[PDB]
């Protein structure tokens, strides 16, 4: 069904009091929950989202310069002046340079030189804050066992639920099975509110705050962003050795690759509609199952012949999947399905993960998939009852 193919799959069995089951979810996997006299339920954390992320600071990693100008004074002739000195968008540099008869001065002393160049940001990165109240977790719950395969359905057998730090509880409504209660809480170890959400050229990371604050790049505070004011423009703007009347101004190359190098190992994230999308958390949920019911408890056993349509396969966790075909028309009915070691008494052994298997189709030759938890050492998969039962040898869990 859902959980069978996933590698990071956990199994939780409920206890005799059929009320509470504790579970922990993560983005890589899913959990299969089995309770006595209850339908088996697969629970998966689907997405983790952050909303309303506020700009903290923006760093410019590629910039350019324009309108380069210089002013010079002969010695004893005062301070060099440019109108661009007071402009906040201009990087400027003032020095003293050797002057003389070669460069047009009466004396040979030091003359003042100033050089300014306009700063423009071509490409920048943006960091955003994460507030605890703005996290949301989406969880999918499914009933283990259905007539047709495939993971694309939304009906009485499946439910999608949404939880929030300020709304930690929710109810997933199945069909005749009833309802399931969810009380969820983040697991300790990864607090997203202690990280910054970093975006650079349609790529997204989760970074530490003190590393983000110490980045040696031009930056602005992420407020009043109509036209920005850039602090530390000198991190990308350099002035070469000065000669009389002029200084050369150069821009450093794009620093996107350097930031990429420094970002190795950082948690990666995504954007979905101005919502941050994370894949690294853990979520502890308590299941309230007192309202969960099986459906076909009082069905009569299927009496026609079952046939294996597929060779049974062993999953990564030692369970067995079996696809069968029922030629019967008398339905709905309960399919006899078990693991047996003593072939005469047919005493059930192992575990039946797909709880209360049933054929819901009234037509002939309906196909259905089963999951079983076999015991260690040789056993037999037994499907059906009577002289029409089918048997298949199996080895271990």
Number of continuous helical runs: 2
> What is the percent of helical residues?
under 10%
Please describe the biggest sheet, giving its number of strands, its sense, and whether it closes into a barrel.
13 strands, mixed
Query: What's the count of strands?
Result: 29
CATH class of the domain at 306-394: Mainly Beta
Write down the Rg.
35 Å
> What's the CATH topology name of the domain at 306-394?
Immunoglobulin-like
Which structural class is indicated by helix and strand composition? mainly beta
- Name the overall outline: rod-shaped
Using the 3D structure, state the CATH architecture of the domain at 306-394.
Sandwich
User: Strand fraction band?
Assistant: 35-45%
Distance between the termini: 19 Å
Key terms:
397 residues; mainly beta; Immunoglobulin-like; 13-stranded mixed beta sheet; 2 helices; Genome polyprotein; viral protein
């Amino acid at each position: 069904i859902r959980c069978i193919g996933v590698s990071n799959r956990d199994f939780v069995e409920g206890m005799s009091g059929g009320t509470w089951v504790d579970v922990v979810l993560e983005h890589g996997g899913c959990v299969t929950v089995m309770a006595q006299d209850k339908p088996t339920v697969d629970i998966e954390l689907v997405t983790t989202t952050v909303s309303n992320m506020a700009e903290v600071r923006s760093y410019c990693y590629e910039a350019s310069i324009s309108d380069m100008a210089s002013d010079s004074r002969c010695p004893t002739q005062g301070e060099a002046y440019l109108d661009k000195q007071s402009d906040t968008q201009y990087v400027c540099k003032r020095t003293l340079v050797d002057r003389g008869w070669g460069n047009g001065c009466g004396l040979f002393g030091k003359g003042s030189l100033v050089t300014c160049a306009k700063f423009a940001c071509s490409k920048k990165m943006t960091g955003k804050s994460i507030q605890p109240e703005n996290l949301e977790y989406r969880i999918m719950l499914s009933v283990h066992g259905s007539q047709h395969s495939g993971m694309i359905e939304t009906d009485e057998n499946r439910a999608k639920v949404e939880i929030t730090p300020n709304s930690p509880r929710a109810e997933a409504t199945l069909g005749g099975f009833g309802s399931l209660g969810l009380d969820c809480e983040p697991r300790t170890g990864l607090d997203f509110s202690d990280l910054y959400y970093l975006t650079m050229n349609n790529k997204h990371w989760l970074v530490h705050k003190e590393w983000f604050h110490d980045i040696p790049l031009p930056w602005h505070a992420g407020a009043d962003t109509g036209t920005p004011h850039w602090n530390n423009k000198e991190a990308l703007v350099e002035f070469k050795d000065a000669h009389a009347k002029r200084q050369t101004v150069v821009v450093l190359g794009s620093q996107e690759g350097a930031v990429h190098t420094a970002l190795a190992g950082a948690l990666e994230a995504e954007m979905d509609g101005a919502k941050g999308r994370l894949s690294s958390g853990h979520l502890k949920c308590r299941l309230k199952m007192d309202k969960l019911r099986l459906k076909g408890v009082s069905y009569s056993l299927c009496t026609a012949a079952f046939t294996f349509t597929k060779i049974p396969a062993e999953t990564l966790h030692g369970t067995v999947t079996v696809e069968v075909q029922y030629a019967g028309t008398d339905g709905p009915c309960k399919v006899p399905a078990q693991m047996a070691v003593d072939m005469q008494t047919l005493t059930p052994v192992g575990r039946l993960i797909t709880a209360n298997p049933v054929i819901t189709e009234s037509t002939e030759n309906s196909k259905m998939m089963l999951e079983l938890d076999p015991p260690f050492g040789d056993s037999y998969i037994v499907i059906g009852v009577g002289e029409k039962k089918i048997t298949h040898h199996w080895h271990r869990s």
